[PDB]
Structures are given as structure tokens and as C-alpha cells.
Design an enzyme around this catalytic site. Sequence first.
Site, PDB file in Angstrom:
ATOM      1  N   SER A   1      -4.015  -7.723  -1.216  1.00 22.08           N
ATOM      2  CA  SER A   1      -4.764  -6.856  -0.308  1.00 22.08           C
ATOM      3  C   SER A   1      -5.453  -5.715  -1.043  1.00 22.08           C
ATOM      4  O   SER A   1      -4.793  -4.854  -1.638  1.00 22.08           O
ATOM      5  CB  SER A   1      -3.860  -6.300   0.788  1.00 22.08           C
ATOM      6  OG  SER A   1      -4.526  -5.269   1.489  1.00 22.08           O
ATOM      7  N   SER A   6      -7.633  -2.285  -1.256  1.00 24.34           N
ATOM      8  CA  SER A   6      -7.925  -1.044  -0.548  1.00 24.34           C
ATOM      9  C   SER A   6      -9.243  -0.468  -1.076  1.00 24.34           C
ATOM     10  O   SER A   6      -9.346  -0.098  -2.252  1.00 24.34           O
ATOM     11  CB  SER A   6      -6.794  -0.053  -0.715  1.00 24.34           C
ATOM     12  OG  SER A   6      -7.213   1.206  -0.255  1.00 24.34           O
ATOM     13  N   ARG A  55      -4.900 -10.055   4.853  1.00 30.09           N
ATOM     14  CA  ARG A  55      -5.594 -10.178   6.141  1.00 30.09           C
ATOM     15  C   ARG A  55      -6.939 -10.859   5.994  1.00 30.09           C
ATOM     16  O   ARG A  55      -7.396 -11.523   6.924  1.00 30.09           O
ATOM     17  CB  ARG A  55      -5.785  -8.846   6.851  1.00 30.09           C
ATOM     18  CG  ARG A  55      -5.522  -8.974   8.340  1.00 30.09           C
ATOM     19  CD  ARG A  55      -6.603  -8.412   9.238  1.00 30.09           C
ATOM     20  NE  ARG A  55      -6.813  -6.979   9.044  1.00 30.09           N
ATOM     21  CZ  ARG A  55      -7.377  -6.166   9.935  1.00 30.09           C
ATOM     22  NH1 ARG A  55      -7.786  -6.619  11.127  1.00 30.09           N
ATOM     23  NH2 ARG A  55      -7.525  -4.883   9.623  1.00 30.09           N
ATOM     24  N   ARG A  56      -7.577 -10.657   4.843  1.00 31.16           N
ATOM     25  CA  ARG A  56      -8.725 -11.446   4.435  1.00 31.16           C
ATOM     26  C   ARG A  56      -8.173 -12.782   3.946  1.00 31.16           C
ATOM     27  O   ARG A  56      -7.130 -12.823   3.288  1.00 31.16           O
ATOM     28  CB  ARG A  56      -9.511 -10.726   3.335  1.00 31.16           C
ATOM     29  CG  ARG A  56     -10.160  -9.417   3.791  1.00 31.16           C
ATOM     30  CD  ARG A  56     -11.254  -8.945   2.840  1.00 31.16           C
ATOM     31  NE  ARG A  56     -10.895  -7.722   2.123  1.00 31.16           N
ATOM     32  CZ  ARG A  56     -11.286  -6.498   2.472  1.00 31.16           C
ATOM     33  NH1 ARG A  56     -12.049  -6.315   3.533  1.00 31.16           N
ATOM     34  NH2 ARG A  56     -10.908  -5.442   1.759  1.00 31.16           N
ATOM     35  N   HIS A  72       0.782  -1.251   0.000  1.00 29.72           N
ATOM     36  CA  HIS A  72       0.000   0.000   0.000  1.00 29.72           C
ATOM     37  C   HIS A  72       0.817   1.308   0.000  1.00 29.72           C
ATOM     38  O   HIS A  72       0.328   2.355   0.446  1.00 29.72           O
ATOM     39  CB  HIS A  72      -1.049   0.000   1.117  1.00 29.72           C
ATOM     40  CG  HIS A  72      -2.029  -1.123   1.015  1.00 29.72           C
ATOM     41  ND1 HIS A  72      -2.999  -1.177   0.035  1.00 29.72           N
ATOM     42  CD2 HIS A  72      -2.189  -2.237   1.765  1.00 29.72           C
ATOM     43  CE1 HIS A  72      -3.717  -2.273   0.192  1.00 29.72           C
ATOM     44  NE2 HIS A  72      -3.244  -2.936   1.232  1.00 29.72           N
ATOM     45  N   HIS A 120      -7.119   0.863  -4.874  1.00 28.66           N
ATOM     46  CA  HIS A 120      -6.011   0.146  -5.532  1.00 28.66           C
ATOM     47  C   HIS A 120      -5.876  -1.273  -4.959  1.00 28.66           C
ATOM     48  O   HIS A 120      -6.594  -1.645  -4.030  1.00 28.66           O
ATOM     49  CB  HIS A 120      -4.685   0.929  -5.392  1.00 28.66           C
ATOM     50  CG  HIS A 120      -4.226   1.101  -3.979  1.00 28.66           C
ATOM     51  ND1 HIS A 120      -4.483   2.241  -3.250  1.00 28.66           N
ATOM     52  CD2 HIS A 120      -3.541   0.275  -3.155  1.00 28.66           C
ATOM     53  CE1 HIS A 120      -3.979   2.108  -2.036  1.00 28.66           C
ATOM     54  NE2 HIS A 120      -3.403   0.923  -1.952  1.00 28.66           N
TER      55      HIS A 120
END
Lengths: 220, 220, 13, 13
Positions: free
Chosen positions: A112, A114, A130-131, A43, A122
Site C-alpha cells: 500500500s 501513501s 486496496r488497489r 501505515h 512511504h
Amino acid sequence: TPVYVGGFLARYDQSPDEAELLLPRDVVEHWLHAVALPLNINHDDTAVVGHVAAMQSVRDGLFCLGCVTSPRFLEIVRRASEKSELVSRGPVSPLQPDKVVEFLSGSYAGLSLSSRRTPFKHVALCSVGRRRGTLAVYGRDPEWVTQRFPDLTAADRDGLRAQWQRCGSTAVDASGDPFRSDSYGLLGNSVDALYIRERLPKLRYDKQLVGVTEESYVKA
Amino acid sequence: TPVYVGGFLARYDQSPDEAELLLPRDVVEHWLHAVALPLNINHDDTAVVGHVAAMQSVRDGLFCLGCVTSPRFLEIVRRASEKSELVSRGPVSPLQPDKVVEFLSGSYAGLSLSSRRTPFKHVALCSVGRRRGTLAVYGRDPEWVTQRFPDLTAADRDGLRAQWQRCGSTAVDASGDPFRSDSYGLLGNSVDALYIRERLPKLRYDKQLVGVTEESYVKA
Amino acid sequence: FITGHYWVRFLPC
Amino acid sequence: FITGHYWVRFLPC
């Protein structure tokens, strides 16, 4: 060559511990109705390595197919790949050694998203998502990486194929390199990845769930 | 400033799974009887970051106190440390933030001896040691890092102090920088560290065994 | 923004 | 040489 990356950004059949990470089929699909998202590393706005080539809400989750284009980034990966004992050991038969793909496969095993709560911002490559179910599958051929996931229907693949085959602006006659970071950043990111508690069972979990047990470069 | 590193290279009270990793008190002590070992990163000859300042066979193991000197290496660590979310979070009260020490603490949490079967070759900083009890403890003050280990006697510390206080050759009026590698190498090394199965329980195990539960920079 | 990351969890909007 | 490492296990002598 660029490298393609496939995987789920969320899964409908997985319920997160942190309730903020909920992302249901109603919400995902309405969001896809409402110019191509950047692909970054952990990120970091300065670590854009390309773009999301396709997005598809399928039976089990939000699936996406990103494209890693940056010469500056892929060159960091190249030099680093020749200094990994994991990469030296190779991939499973019958795949050809591909130091660049293998390193990304090992290093950035997760996806991941966002998103809000325009709704998607993005996608980040990262060590683990984390998922759950968010395993990143790299490879040179996008038809090939999409075929790693056996539960995707031919209906699903067609919708995906449509997006990554769609021609970009015929106007500019070059391909820009978005990457504005360095190997020092990627090194800085690496410590954090070491301190994600039980990363490898999380990755193993993701792998069998999405059925990536079918020859792959996945290192977990 | 240089950074000092303390920890066991082997432990007498720990029996390795791989019998080749046996290293008993008779053998260690006879070897110490039979000009200062290099400190490298993951046993790479090109990644020498300094030297072993002291070695002492104590009640529980072979303890050593290495010294990380390289400006080229510590500068890589500095730039990388400002790009870690772990380092950003800080150390436990009441210690001062020290980005350089914290990064090494996280990244190179283990010690690994290279020995025969002259008998000791060098010491490698690494993510985790394969021999248990080999936690690396970093810090600016060598008296301080040696004090992290509560089971070391004052008899033990004196023997150690003797070695790191001993003046080197008065002849050359500079301090050479042995480091002949780069951040690409250190990045290459990082993937491998991710694929050591249950690294963090191994590190937790090492920590309580050697009683590093007393303010430290240890990230595990 | 909410991310699916371990370290960078929230993100300004 | 024998090392206490996970990846670089043996070492020429």
C-alpha cells in the site's frame, strides 16, 4: 539477513472502484522526477521496518522493491513464525523452507502506497492492498524477487538494479534499526486483516494478474 | 474482570462435509453422563486461558459457556486491542465500548471442541470452527451472553446457570493463571486464520443459524 | 495523503 | 482426538 520485497504499488491497467485511488502514468512519472522512503507496517509511523530500495514506472504499473531490515521486527517475525501451522506446512518445491520469509509472505501479502491528493510519503506492508495488482513478493535475493514478475522487461530490471545496488552514505559505520513498535501492535493489526471482506480472492486476483506463477513463497 | 464466552461446539441440525466431525445427540448426551475442561487458544496446551464453566445438550446442539480468566492472556489482548482499527471503530448501539471483549470477538470468533473418535478433552477458541454453527459470543456477564442465543429455552438456561454458579473448591484462596504462552504464539496463530478460505461467510452462516441477531459484540 | 489500504485510508498532511 | 479446527485436526491420545 534482511528480506527483500517486490511488487506493484499501483497498476495502469487496473481501474479502482474508489476514484480517489486513480494514479496514472503521467502523474506517477512526473512524481518520480520530483532520502529514501520508509517501509512501515499498516501505515504505522512506529512500525518502520526499513526502506524502499527502488521505484520504477514500467509498462503496467508503478513497481517498487522495498527492503525489510529491522532486527527488532525480524526477531518478532522469527518467534511468531515458529508458531504458525501454515509456516510448518512449508513452501512449494523446489524452494528451501524459510520460516521468516514464509510468515511475511502469508501475513503481509499486500502493498500500500501513501501518496499525495514531496508527493510519495512511504510504503506500507499490509495484509491486502486496496488497489488491485499490489501483491507483495518476499525473498532473500532482490534479483530473485524481481525475477518473480515475468512481465518486467530487462530494461525495467536494469533500472531497478541500479537503485538497490547504489551505495548508501559511507559516513556512518552502522545500520540503524528504525522499528519503534512491538508484537502487540502487530497482533492488534491482525484482527483488521481478518475483516477485509474476500481478502483471498483479491490476493488470487493480484497473483495471476502480475503473473507470479513462475516457484514463489506467496501463500495465496 | 474475566470474560465469558458462549456458543455451540456442535450442532444436531448441521451435517458436516467431513464425516469424522459427526457428533449426534445420542453420543453427546451419553458422553455428558461419563475436573473442568481447559479453555485454550487454537488447541495449544500452552495457551490455556481458562475453563469450560457449563455444557448443555439443547434442542439444536451441544452448547457450552467457557470462562476466559488468564491475567497474562487478557493483558496481551488489552495491549493488542489498542492497536486495532476494527476495535477503534467500536460496537453497535447501544453497547458500551469494551476493547478487550471486542478484540476477542473479532480475533477468536469460532469454537472448536476436542473430543474422542474421558470423551471430551478441552475447548479451543479459534478464528472459525470447522463444524458449522460454532460462533463464539463473548461478554462480561454470563447471563447476558447466554441471552444472545434466542432459541435456548428457559429450561436450557437453568441447566447452564446451575453449572457456572456452582462454587469451586473453598480450599485454595487464590485463582491460578494457567496461561503458559505469549503474544508471539498468538501472532503465529494469526497467519493461519488468514488462510482459512471464506472465513467470513462461514461466520455469517453461523451467526444467523444460531440467531445472534438480537445487539452483540460479534464482529462478523 | 491517500493510501491504498483498507483500514488507514486518509493520512494527515 | 478429533477437533473442529481447520489447522490442528487430529490430536494424540
